[PDB]
Structure formats: structure tokens, C-alpha cells
Amino acid sequence: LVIERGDGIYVEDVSGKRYIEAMSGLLSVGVGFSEPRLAEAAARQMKKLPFYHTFSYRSHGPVIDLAEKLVSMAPVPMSKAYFTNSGSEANDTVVKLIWYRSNALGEPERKKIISRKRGYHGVTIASASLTGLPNNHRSFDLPIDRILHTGCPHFYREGQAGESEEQFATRLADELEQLIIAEGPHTIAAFIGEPVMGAGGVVVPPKTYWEKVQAVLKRYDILLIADEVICGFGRTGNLFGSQTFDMKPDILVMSKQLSSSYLPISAFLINERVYAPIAEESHKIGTLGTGFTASGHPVAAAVALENLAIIEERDLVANARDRGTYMQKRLRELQDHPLVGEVRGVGLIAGVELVTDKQAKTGLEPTGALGAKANAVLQERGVISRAMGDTLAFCPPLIINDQQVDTMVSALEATLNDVQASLTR
């Protein structure tokens, strides 16, 4: 499929066929594909100061405004913002600064990072190691040393026979505590988690998961990294997924949804607990020895500022919340369809996991074929979704309206009826 242009929630292929972009590109195009104010902000800044760097006591207006804006928006008190080009780079720099911080606190052994199976955190050698998906690892010799993985909080696929949802949450927290104790709690620097796992199949954690996990982390004074790369800026029904799930991160990572993917930019926020010992170490060394050439890029920063202004001016967090409520309801009305194993989601993100045998939770051979078959029909019916194995993901732009949600979910129902009628046989 060759995509040539976009407009609102739609993209068009070279033949002129229009599709609802049900994943907003890479779960990132928040304001849709034709927001003219973002091009206006880019063109204005690029003709004033197209590039300057933030190295060595230099700065510029756009990054200063954006740093203030992001800190002011934080769901918990934050101290500083640091800028990169991608979410992958951000998580990579976060791991590096966590090691630096532990050295700056006289803890040379507190260097291990706990991630989760099916988590997604980027593609650098380090951030691909954090990533808990199989295709990211073995043939790349990953994960690197110091990165650990605990279990995926996906009740439908990980719960034991007869186990309740909250018992499953308790078991995950206990398995996390068991991991920390067996590794040596003083060796664990941080735990990283998406509020909801996006690329791993839209895994919504069981209720009480984040409360119980945070109790464990607080017991050992382990840092919490909230990876808001997908869940940020209105996706889950609040500005940040951390608010939706009552998470209190020390570090909060944001991706190019900062700019609705219109330009490469990413950032993370750190609280005073993280910043202060890093600042003192940088003073003993004489510099903080890291940074990307385009960190804080003024044109990307200008576009991000305008993108955030649009989200606030047009109340897009509330719009996503309310369209999300309607989408979640419409999708769950398909629960009784013969091919629907599970419907999961919160706010404006959802997954529909397909099966052909509901009791055994199995689909076609191999797993992935059913999702690939349904996704092809869905595309033909004018909706672009992402098949994550046998899960179809829905993550449309924040500007969508109820009429468009209705069209998207009706296309999915018709798709499932088509696939059902064709499987026999």
C-alpha cells in the first residue's frame, strides 16, 4: 500500500482510495494529517533560526518555551526537561543517566533495569534490550547485560486457571518482588513501563497492578520510568497515561507525538531526586558528557509548542476521552462475535484479539494468520489498522468524531462477518 497524502483522519493511496488511519500512523499523528498551523509554525521558525544547538551553555527561544511548557504540564512535580530526536534515543539516554546517577550517589552496583515482556521501548542496542518483544533480540545478541524482564500483565494470556484479575495483579507484583530480592535489591536502579503496552498488543494492565507494583518499588526506593511514548498527550482519556493509571514516575518519557509526528522530536522529564545528583556529578567532571546534535531542535520545538497549543485550544484531551468512551463501548458490542477472543482498551486505544476457538483461545495456524487475514479485508473496507499477531489495534487521531468512530467500528464488524463466512471453508 503506497500512501501519498493525508487529510484529517484519512490517508490516500496513489490510486485515490481513502482510508481511515486507525493507528494515526505510528500511534503518533494526534492532530491528524492536515493541520495547517503546524506547517505555519515550522516555516516561520525555519526562516528565523533554522538551527542552533543546546550544547555548552547555548539555547534558543523555542526549546526554552517547550521545556517550561512540558515541566508545567507534568502529571507529578518535575524539575527539568531534556530533549532528543526519538523515543528510542530518549530511553537510551535515560538508561545512561540512571547509571550516571547511581555512580553520582556512591552506588556502583545499582545499575540493573527491570522491563517487561511485550513492552516496547525503542530500537537502539540499549532500548531494544529494554523492549520485551522476541523479534527485537536473539539475532542481535540482545538484551545487553543489566536489563531484566519481568512478566507481561496480560490477564487474558497470562492468568492461571481460576485466577481472578486482582489476584493476577497481586501475583505479578509478587513475582516482581521475587525478582528484586533474588537479584539483590540494592542492585536494581529502575523499573520501566508503559502505562498501557502499545506495540505489544494494547495490553491494559489488570486493575490494582500499578498500585501494587508501585508499593514494591517504593519499598526498595527503585526509580519508576513511565514510558509515555504512545500513551502521552490524550491517548488514554487523560493528558498522560500516568494520570489514567495513577502512576508517580520519577522520569517521564515522551516521543514525537509531542509534535504529532510532524517533525522528529522527543523529550523526557526528570524530578528533583534525579536531577540534583546528576548536576553535581556534571560539575565534578566539568560537563555532562552526552547529547545529540539536534537536541532541542528549534524548528521541531516550535512545531511541538504549536501542537500542544492546538491540543489545549481545541480541547482534544476531552474529545479523545469522549470519542474513546464511545469507541470502547462499540468495540465491546462485538464481544459475542464468533471470532472475537478479547476486546481491551482505555480512552482512545483498543485492541481486538481474534480467535477461532474461544475456550482454547486459539486461532489459525500459525498465530498471526487470522489477524493478517482480517486486516487485509479491513483495509479493503477503508480502514488501516495494525495487526499485532492476531490482535487488531485501533488508535485513531484525537480529532476523530463519533460519526467517524461509528464508520470505523462498522467496517470492523463487516470485516469479521466476511472472515467468518470465508473460514467455512
Ligand X SMILES: Cc1ncc(COP(=O)(O)O)c(CN)c1O
* C-alpha R_g of the chain: 22
Nearest Cα residue to 230 out of 348, 137, 321:
348
All 3 cell numbers of residue 226? 513511565
In order of 87, 127, 284, the CA distances from 91 in angstroms are 6, 6, 25
Interacting positions 293-352 with ligand X (CB under 6 A): 293
- With CB under 8 A as the contact rule, which of the stretches 165-173, 175-183, 276-284, 394-402 interacts with its own copies? 276-284
Closest distance of CB 38 from its own copies, Å: 7
Question: What torsion do the CA atoms of 67, 68, 73, 75 make, to the nearest 10 degrees?
Answer: 70
Q: Does 87 bind ligand X (CB under 6 A)?
A: yes
Interface with ligand X, residue 88, by CB under 6 A: yes
The edge-to-edge listing of strands for the beta sheet with 391-394 is 340-346, 349-354, 391-394, 386-388
Q: Point out which span in 157-165, 257-265, 313-321, 331-339 binds its own copies (CB under 8 A).
A: 257-265
- Pick one of ligand X, its own copies, none as the site partner of residue 290 (Cβ within 5 to 8 A by kind): its own copies
Decide whether 103 or 420 has the Cβ nearer to its own copies.
Answer: 103
Distance CA 317, CA 224 (A): 25
Q: How far is CA 377 from the centre of its chain?
A: 27
Residues 103-142: x where in contact with ligand X by CB under 6 A, - otherwise, as a string: -----------------xxx--------------------
Q: Which stretch binds its own copies (CB under 8 A): 201-209, 286-294, 338-346, 405-413?
A: 286-294
Considering CB distances under 5 to 8 angstroms, the limit depending on partner class, which of its own copies, ligand X, none binds residue 370?
none
Q: Provide the grid cell at 16.
A: 485515490
* Cβ neighbours around 360 below 10 Å, total: 9
Is residue 92 at the binding interface for ligand X, with CB under 6 A as the rule? no
Minimum distance of its own copies from residue 322's CB (angstroms): 25
| Strand partners of residue 227 | 253
Residues 15-44 that bind its own copies (CB under 8 A): 25-26, 28-29, 33-36, 38-40, 42-43
Which DSSP state fits 357?
B
Applying CB under 8 A, among 76, 103, 159, 413 the residue interacting with its own copies is 103
Contact present, 267 and 259 (Cβ < 8 Å): no
132 counts as binding its own copies under rule CB under 8 A: no
Beta carbons of 311 and 397 less than 8 angstroms apart:
no
Which one of its own copies, ligand X, none is in contact with 404 (Cβ closer than 5 to 8 A by kind)?
none
Q: Quick one: which H or E segment has residue 112? A: strand 112-116
190-209 positions binding ligand X, by CB under 6 A = 194, 198-199
126 binds its own copies (CB under 8 A): yes
Residue number of the CB closest to ligand X reads: 87
Residue 6 within binding range of its own copies, rule CB under 8 A = yes
Pick from 22, 95, 152, 230 the residue near ligand X by CB under 6 A: 230
**Contact pick of 20, 22, 73, 93 for its own copies (by CB under 8 A):** 93
206 secondary structure, DSSP code: P
- Cβ atoms of residues 88 and 123 within 8 Å: yes
Interacting positions 162-201 with its own copies (CB under 8 A) = none
Q: Please report, as residue ranges, which positions from 334 to 363 form the binding site for its own copies (by CB under 8 A).
A: none
* Nearest distance, CB of residue 214 and ligand X, angstroms: 19
User: 3-class DSSP state for residue 296?
Assistant: coil
- C-alpha to C-alpha distance for 325 and 409, rounded to whole angstroms: 13
298-313 and 316-332 helices cross at what angle (nearest 10)? Answer: 70
74's contact among its own copies, ligand X, none, with CB below 5 to 8 A by partner kind, is none
The DSSP bridge partners found for residue 149 are 115
**Which residue of 9, 73, 81, 226 would you call a contact of its own copies, by CB under 8 A?**
81
| Residues of the shown chain interacting with ligand X in the complex, contacts defined by CB under 6 A | 86-88, 91, 120-122, 194, 198-199, 227, 229-230, 255, 292-293
